[PDB]
C-alpha cells in the first residue's frame, strides 16, 4: 500500500482519489493519502472551492515512482511532483503517518469497482494519450481538447485519443461504401483492432480512460471518444464473442458508478438508444441494458 503525501493544503479544495472525495479547508492540516492499493492506476483530482471552474488531476501508478502533491501559488494549482531521493520520501511519509495527518484510501474489501473501471488501463498507454514525457504521471483537466477536436488549438496540451470518424476514407473501403457504412466490422476488426490497437485490451483501455476523464473532469472530448468507441463495436455485425461479453461488463460498471445527477450531460441519448435497441449488438449487452433501463429509463 503506497502513499501520496501533500506538502500542505493552502487553499480550500475538494480532493478526489478515484471514486472517493473529501473536502479540505483552507490551511487545514492535511498531508495526503495513504493505503493506496498497488496494482492499478489511480487518479488524484481537484476542484477548488473558490472556482469550481477547471476540475483537474493526475493519473499515476505508485509502482513507477514516489509522487507527492505541492501547491504552487504562482500557477494557482496543486501540482504532482516526483521525489527521487528515496530516503527523504520514506522519512517524510513516516512522520506524517505517525502524526495521523493522512486520509486512508477507503476501499471496502468486497468492492471491485475500481478494478472493474480500470481493468485494461495501463500507465504506459495513458502517457501516449497525454504527452509530457519528462513526468511519470499525467495531467488532465476539464478544458483539454482532443486531437480530433483540434482538426475541426495548442498541440502540447491535447488528448491524443485514436481518431474515429465513420465518414472517412479510413472507415470506408472504395467499392464497399454501403457495406462498410452500414456494417463497421472492417473498420473495427481490421483498421482499428488489428491495425492500430493491436488487440482488444488496448482498445478497452482507451475506452475506459476516456470514460473516466469524461466523468471526473467533465471533459467533453473524452465523452465523445467513449461514445464513439462504444458505437464502433455496436455498429459492427462481426465482433469476437469475448469482446462483446467484456464490453457488457465494462459498460455495466461505468453506468453503475456514474452519479444519477450527471447523466444528462455524460450520456448521449442517440448513441445509447441506437446501441441498445437498433444496432447489430442490440441483444448482446444484457447487463448494460438492464442497468440502463432501471437507472435511466428517461434517457431511453
Amino acid at each position: 500500500m503506497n502513499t501520496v503525501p501533500f506538502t500542505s493544503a493552502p487553499i480550500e479544495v475538494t480532493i478526489g482519489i478515484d471514486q472517493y472525495s473529501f473536502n479540505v479547508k483552507e490551511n487545514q492540516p492535511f498531508h495526503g493519502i495513504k493505503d493506496i492499493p498497488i496494482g492499478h492506476v489511480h487518479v488524484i483530482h481537484f476542484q477548488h472551492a473558490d472556482n469550481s471552474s477547471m476540475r483537474y488531476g493526475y493519473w499515476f501508478d505508485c509502482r513507477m515512482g514516489n509522487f507527492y502533491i505541492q501547491y504552487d501559488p504562482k500557477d494557482g494549482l496543486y501540482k504532482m511532483m516526483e521525489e527521487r531521493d528515496g530516503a527523504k520520501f520514506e522519512n517524510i511519509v513516516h512522520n506524517f503517518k505517525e502524526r495521523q495527518m493522512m486520509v486512508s484510501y477507503p476501499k471496502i474489501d468486497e468492492d471491485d469497482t475500481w478494478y472493474n473501471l480500470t481493468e485494461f488501463v495501463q500507465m504506459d498507454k495513458i502517457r501516449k494519450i497525454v504527452r509530457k514525457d519528462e513526468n511519470q504521471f499525467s495531467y488532465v483537466d476539464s478544458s483539454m481538447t482532443t486531437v480530433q477536436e483540434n482538426e475541426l488549438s495548442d498541440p502540447a496540451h491535447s488528448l491524443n485519443y485514436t481518431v474515429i470518424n465513420f465518414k472517412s476514407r479510413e472507415a470506408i473501403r472504395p467499392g464497399h461504401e454501403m457495406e462498410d457504412f452500414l456494417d463497421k466490422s472492417y473498420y473495427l476488426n481490421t483498421v482499428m483492432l488489428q491495425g492500430i490497437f493491436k488487440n482488444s485490451s488496448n482498445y478497452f483501455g482507451e475506452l475506459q480512460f476516456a470514460f473516466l476523464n469524461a466523468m471526473f473532469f467533465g471533459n467533453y472530448g473524452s465523452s465523445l471518444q467513449w461514445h464513439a468507441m462504444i458505437e464502433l463495436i455496436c455498429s459492427s455485425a462481426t465482433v469476437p464473442k469475448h469482446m462483446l461479453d467484456k464490453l457488457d461488463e465494462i459498460l455495466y460498471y461505468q453506468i453503475k458508478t456514474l452519479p444519477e445527477q450527471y447523466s444528462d450531460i455524460l450520456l448521449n441519448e442517440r448513441v445509447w438508444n441506437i446501441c441498445l435497441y437498433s444496432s447489430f449488438q442490440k441483444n448482446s449487452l444484457h447487463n448494460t441494458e438492464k442497468i440502463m433501463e432501471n437507472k435511466y429509463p428517461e434517457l431511453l
Binding site: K167, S168, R169, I172, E177, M178, F181, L182
Partner: protein, 237 residues
C-alpha cells in the same frame, strides 16, 4: 447548409451545381399472389440529376436487373443513386465537375457523402424546398425511354428545350417547376393544357411544345389555375 427560399438565386450563379432526385429510382407495382398474399414487381426507374443553370438533365436509367437477388431495396436504392452520381462526377473533366450537389431528400445525404469522400471540395447539401421532380416521369419522352430500356443506360436531355435563348435560367427553372407541380397535382388536366391545341407541336428533339412567348404566358396562367383548382378540389375551399 440547407437550400431554401432565402438563398434561391444561388441556383443561377456561375458555380456549377446539380440537383439529385431519387424518388423514381426504385419503382414497384404491388399485386396479389395466387395464394392471396401481396408481392411487388419492380419496374425500370431513373435518377434525375439536373444542372438548374444550363438545363442539362443526366437521366440515369435504373433497369430492374440491378435489384435481382438484393434485399432492403429502398435502402439499396439510395446507395445505388449515390454510386451512380459519384460515377458521373468522376467521368467529367475537373473544370466540368459540380462544386455542390443538392439532394432533394435528406436520406440521400449520408449515402452521397460517403460515395464522394474522394471529393472533399464538393459540398453535399439538403434543401427545404418541396421540389416537384418526382413528376419527371409524367414527361412523356422521359417515361418512354425509361420503360423501353433493356439495360442500364444514361440518356441526356435539356429539360428547358431552347428556352434559354429567350429567358434567363431563373425564369426557366420557375417555368419548369410550375409545369412539374401541375403534372404532379393533376396529370390529366396538366397534359390536356399542354397539348390541347394541335397546331403547337413538340419538336422531335424537345420535351415540351414550341410555345411563343405569349402562348407560354397563357399556358403558365392555365397551370396556376389548375394548381389552385386542385387545391380547392382537395381541401374544399
Amino acid at each position: 447548409g440547407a437550400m431554401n427560399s432565402s438563398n434561391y438565386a444561388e441556383l443561377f450563379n456561375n458555380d456549377i451545381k446539380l440537383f439529385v432526385d431519387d424518388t423514381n429510382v426504385y419503382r414497384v407495382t404491388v399485386h396479389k399472389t395466387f395464394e392471396g398474399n401481396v408481392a411487388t414487381k419492380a419496374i425500370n426507374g431513373c435518377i434525375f440529376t439536373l444542372n438548374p443553370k444550363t438545363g442539362h438533365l443526366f437521366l440515369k436509367i435504373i433497369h430492374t436487373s440491378v435489384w435481382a437477388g438484393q434485399k432492403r431495396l429502398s435502402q439499396l436504392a439510395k446507395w445505388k443513386t449515390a454510386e451512380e452520381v459519384s460515377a458521373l462526377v468522376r467521368s467529367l473533366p475537373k473544370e466540368e465537375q459540380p462544386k455542390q450537389i443538392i439532394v432533394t431528400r435528406k436520406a440521400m445525404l449520408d449515402p452521397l457523402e460517403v460515395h464522394m469522400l474522394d471529393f472533399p471540395n464538393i459540398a453535399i447539401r439538403p434543401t427545404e424546398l418541396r421540389l416537384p421532380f418526382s413528376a419527371a416521369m409524367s414527361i412523356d419522352k422521359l417515361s418512354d425511354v425509361v420503360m423501353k430500356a433493356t439495360e442500364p443506360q444514361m440518356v441526356l436531355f435539356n429539360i428547358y428545350d431552347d428556352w434559354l435563348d429567350r429567358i434567363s435560367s431563373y425564369t426557366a427553372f420557375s417555368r419548369l417547376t410550375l409545369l412539374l407541380r401541375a403534372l404532379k397535382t393533376n396529370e390529366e388536366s396538366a397534359k390536356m393544357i399542354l397539348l390541347s391545341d394541335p397546331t403547337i407541336t413538340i419538336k422531335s428533339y424537345h420535351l415540351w411544345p414550341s410555345f411563343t412567348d405569349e402562348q407560354w404566358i397563357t399556358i403558365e396562367s392555365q397551370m396556376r389555375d389548375l394548381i389552385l383548382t386542385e387545391y380547392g378540389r382537395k381541401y374544399n375551399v
